[PDB]
Amino acid sequence: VGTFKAKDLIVTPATILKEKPDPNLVFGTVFTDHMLTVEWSSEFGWEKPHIKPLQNLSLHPGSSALHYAVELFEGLKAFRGVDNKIRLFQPNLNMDRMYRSAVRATLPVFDKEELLECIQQLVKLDQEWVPYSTSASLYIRPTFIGTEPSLGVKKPTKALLFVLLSPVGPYFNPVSLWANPKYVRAWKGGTGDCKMGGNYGSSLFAQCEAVDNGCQQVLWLYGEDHQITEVGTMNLFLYWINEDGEEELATPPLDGIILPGVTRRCILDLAHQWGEFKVSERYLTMDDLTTALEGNRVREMFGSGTACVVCPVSDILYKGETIHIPTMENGPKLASRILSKLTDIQYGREERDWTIVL
Amino acid sequence: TFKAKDLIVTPATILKEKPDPNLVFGTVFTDHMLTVEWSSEFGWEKPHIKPLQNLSLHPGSSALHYAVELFEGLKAFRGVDNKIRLFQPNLNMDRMYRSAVRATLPVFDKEELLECIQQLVKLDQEWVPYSTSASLYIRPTFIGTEPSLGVKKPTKALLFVLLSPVGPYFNPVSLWANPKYVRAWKGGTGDCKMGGNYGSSLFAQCEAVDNGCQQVLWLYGEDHQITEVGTMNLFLYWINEDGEEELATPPLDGIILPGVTRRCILDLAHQWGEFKVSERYLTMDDLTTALEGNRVREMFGSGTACVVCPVSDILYKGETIHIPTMENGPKLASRILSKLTDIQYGREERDWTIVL
Ligand SMILES: *Cc1c(COP(=O)(O)O)cnc(C)c1O
Ligand SMILES: *Cc1c(COP(=O)(O)O)cnc(C)c1O
Ligand SMILES: NCC1(CC(=O)O)CCCCC1
Ligand SMILES: NCC1(CC(=O)O)CCCCC1
Ligand SMILES: [Mg+2]
Known part of the structure; x- marks a missing residue:
């Protein structure tokens, strides 16, 4: 019973960064240079959140998210306004829904403020991916999955919370x-x-x-x-x-x-x-x-x-x-x-x- | 479709000891697993029987976001005559195939999959418990590994099979x-x-x-x-x-x-x-x-x-x-x-x- 805290963020910058796409962008196809990952276990609870280079997940083949759909997600955007200030839209509601979903899925609860702040930091580092446009934006995809290695259907004793960033235009x-x-x-x-x-x-x-x-x-x-x-x-x-x-x-x-x-x-x-x-x-x-x-x-x-x-x-x-x-x-x-x-x-x-x- | 004839076998260099048949359902796994990659542009790759390892998946894989996934469950039993048997395996292939279609996951040759499973169990056959009250659970799993977040029919997928010795439930x-x-x-x-x-x-x-x-x-x-x-x-x-x-x-x-x-x-x-x-x-x-x-x-x-x-x-x-x-x-x-x-x-x- 606990949560991870943004002040504990362990940030590992990418040595080689990728070139931004052209604002004029198939939805969810392109991803930024970094991501947010937070490990959990029922034994030690939430580990320290990490902001590292976008990479593949290393999951046990028996992960409950692959067998019994123990997972949930969210989708919100950051907009680079006319005053060139990056803004989030009603993020707190997304944190409220994600939390309500984690509970309905039996996934471990967390502090909404901390996550939202971790997301802030992650978007800040990759703020340049926030489209320098007015018809485009930066799609924020929070994802919560069960990584329980056992095949028995039950509340997971292991989970991974991650956040992806993808610049998008229309739909x-x-x-x-x-x-x-x-x-x-x-x-x-x-x-x-x-x-x-x-x-x-x-x-x-x-x-x-x-x-x-x-x-x-x-x-x-x-x-x-x-x-x-x-x-x-x-x-x-x-x-x-x-x-x-x-x-x-x-x-x-x-x-x-x-x-x-x-x-x-x-x-x-x-x-x-x-x-x-x-x-x-x-x-x-x-x-x-x-x-x-x-x-x-x-x-x-x-x-x-x-x-x-x-x-x-x-x-x-x-x-x-x-x-x-x-x-x-x-x-x-x-x-x-x-x-x-x-x-x-x-x-x-x-x-x-x-x-x-x- | 992939062919069992193209199996690429990479045996584990170190083998794990067999559990006591005690056994908690699906918590112990054998030495190897079967993995077969699929893509929309090239179709199925060759089937691989390799050592049990973590799956390296793109964080956007639809199986993690939209539950683009299905699975099966069947067992291998060590006979009283020491012959290892599969029970109604073709019915599981049939059911898995129907589920693949309803899920929009790629179709495969039912017989080829079964033969690959047979070969996987054969390699890890000593895991089939020497008990008349224990068995080897077989978990064929089929997941979409589509990298994009758009909700659609996957253009990338993975089919794999895990083996797990089990007692009761x-x-x-x-x-x-x-x-x-x-x-x-x-x-x-x-x-x-x-x-x-x-x-x-x-x-x-x-x-x-x-x-x-x-x-x-x-x-x-x-x-x-x-x-x-x-x-x-x-x-x-x-x-x-x-x-x-x-x-x-x-x-x-x-x-x-x-x-x-x-x-x-x-x-x-x-x-x-x-x-x-x-x-x-x-x-x-x-x-x-x-x-x-x-x-x-x-x-x-x-x-x-x-x-x-x-x-x-x-x-x-x-x-x-x-x-x-x-x-x-x-x-x-x-x-x-x-x-x-x-x-x-x-x-x-x-x-x-x-x-x-
Ligand atoms: C995400 C979603 C919506 C839209 O929610 P917004 O927060 O307004 O993006 C609507 N219907 C379903 C089924 C959804 O999954
Ligand atoms: C797998 C399953 C069963 C049992 O089917 P068997 O083929 O006999 O293993 C029953 N109900 C549900 C919902 C199942 O997933
Ligand atoms: N009730 C259990 C199973 C089926 C069975 O073998 O009864 C389905 C969910 C995943 C574990 C197996
Ligand atoms: N219709 C789309 C979304 C929601 C939306 O933003 O309208 C849900 C499925 C995953 C992609 C996003
Ligand atoms: Mg044939």
């Missing part, structure tokens, strides 16, 4: 969605509300089946009434005129099968803040969708996430039929506004608690 | 039944040995442990269907609602993993023909109602690690529900255990075993 460009009720992403009583690796491996089949039909992503449906939950691995937002005739920004509620995105939260806070229209966390089914469509009640639909921020949807292939979404034929005003707002806050073109400097 | 177990957690769901992948299905079980499993139990009784649906005993297929031996003696186990509707042991037990039950054999749904209420009527005789889980694992108690709604398995023999559990072990250790010759 508008409306997307087509593949809606097949035969596949379910999360279930009540499952781990769909956590960022645990196990919830992602089983979706590759659906994804491939998605591209096989010109769709860039999967629209995850759930239950008898086919509630629409998430766009691929992005939270789903629906801007429309509800059943009562009111202008509304809707999104599925956090009832266990939806991941509580940091971007989802921010979009909700902004929406409430403006008070220009009803904001509701409610259930949305395909029928609610189609009925609204054949009434011209829909305006926009988009997914939200750290990677895309705001990703417009234009089509849903459902029951062998392409259902068009007027998202683009309506601006998308709401979606563009939200992008500007967050972008302004991310790159320093506007002050707000949501960001941190260093 | 009748020590009746008590199960913890809490509907709040769900092992797998319709539309899911609970019918595959993909890593993802296990990581989410640890929280419930630990809750079962600090609550006086050793395994989780996985419940599903509004009517609380009893699906599996921990990660072992569930069997109920009783007199059903029609008053018929019956051996029942949940149907393969998608939330149940098709265990080889499960299929074998059903096979044996059907051929003995001494009672009704049913692949059907079983709910906590069917169970409790049956207990009150004294219709339950036995309950046990089945799996490679524990061929037959009897259940004695179930903590359900704030109460401990006793299952009379042990005071009923357990006649059928024993008979079944006896039969299967006799086949595995060669006391009986059957097509379910492959020698050397």
Whole structure:
């Protein structure tokens, strides 16, 4: 029972550094010169955190992360603002979610402040990788895995916490969605509300089946009434005129099968803040969708996430039929506004608690 | 696909001493392992049988981030005639292959993989315990080693096999039944040995442990269907609602993993023909109602690690529900255990075993 502390950081600089890429960058493909690694054991607990040259992990073949998916991750960004100050966006929320995930995965808890500071140091050393752009950023990937060498399924007595850095650009460009009720992403009583690796491996089949039909992503449906939950691995937002005739920004509620995105939260806070229209966390089914469509009640639909921020949807292939979404034929005003707002806050073109400097 | 004919063998320079057959499941490993690299641009590399060593993986490998991984479990047994046998190995190759497809991992020639495994076990054959109550556990593992963080079909992967001598896993177990957690769901992948299905079980499993139990009784649906005993297929031996003696186990509707042991037990039950054999749904209420009527005789889980694992108690709604398995023999559990072990250790010759 304890934690590692940033003041104990053991930094080992890379002798040979790599050349930065061109800001104009396939997501998660390029990695910086250094990484963060912290060992753990139930015997001695957390060791001293290390910032060393990016290298391969040396894992026992029996590591529980390779057999029973004892792992979890996070994804946040650092932005080199217009005032050229490197900033983090709502990092503390990422530390809160990662912690909640480590517990749900039975992985060893840690001090969020210490980790966030270790991440600060790691990004500081490689601050030059933070894209000298305004449409690019630095992707931060915290990863927690069980390295228990035994094959028995149980709480790991060994784990490794690491952080990778990758400069990224994009990921508008409306997307087509593949809606097949035969596949379910999360279930009540499952781990769909956590960022645990196990919830992602089983979706590759659906994804491939998605591209096989010109769709860039999967629209995850759930239950008898086919509630629409998430766009691929992005939270789903629906801007429309509800059943009562009111202008509304809707999104599925956090009832266990939806991941509580940091971007989802921010979009909700902004929406409430403006008070220009009803904001509701409610259930949305395909029928609610189609009925609204054949009434011209829909305006926009988009997914939200750290990677895309705001990703417009234009089509849903459902029951062998392409259902068009007027998202683009309506601006998308709401979606563009939200992008500007967050972008302004991310790159320093506007002050707000949501960001941190260093 | 890789060919067993291209195996590159690098024997360990120093051999480890064999453990006492005592043995804690999957904690001791043999001298060698099988590794086969795959890439999207070149396909499979040649298979390597080399000394047990750590895996050097790029920190971005999808197996660490998105659970792009699956695994298998089977055993080698030293016969009473000293012949080492594999039990239904081709069924594991089949299941592993199906899982590979559902996981979007590269396909391989089932027969070639088996031959590579046979050769690995042959090299470390002295590890196959000289006991009729111990065996050599075989762990084929398939992981995606895609370097990029984008979520997609891997362009790089690794297939490896570890060997581990093991003893047990009748020590009746008590199960913890809490509907709040769900092992797998319709539309899911609970019918595959993909890593993802296990990581989410640890929280419930630990809750079962600090609550006086050793395994989780996985419940599903509004009517609380009893699906599996921990990660072992569930069997109920009783007199059903029609008053018929019956051996029942949940149907393969998608939330149940098709265990080889499960299929074998059903096979044996059907051929003995001494009672009704049913692949059907079983709910906590069917169970409790049956207990009150004294219709339950036995309950046990089945799996490679524990061929037959009897259940004695179930903590359900704030109460401990006793299952009379042990005071009923357990006649059928024993008979079944006896039969299967006799086949595995060669006391009986059957097509379910492959020698050397
Ligand atoms: C990571 C993730 C999101 C988005 O969360 P953000 O913190 O907003 O990046 C949404 N859905 C799923 C399933 C996710 O894994
Ligand atoms: C492996 C496994 C079983 C048992 O299958 P066998 O082929 O008999 O070893 C049962 N349930 C789950 C969830 C499993 O992973
Ligand atoms: N849809 C993508 C992410 C989330 C996001 O940033 O929207 C989750 C899977 C791993 C890559 C990131
Ligand atoms: N219940 C156990 C296993 C199966 C078995 O052999 O019963 C699956 C999880 C990994 C260890 C093996
Ligand atoms: Mg062939």
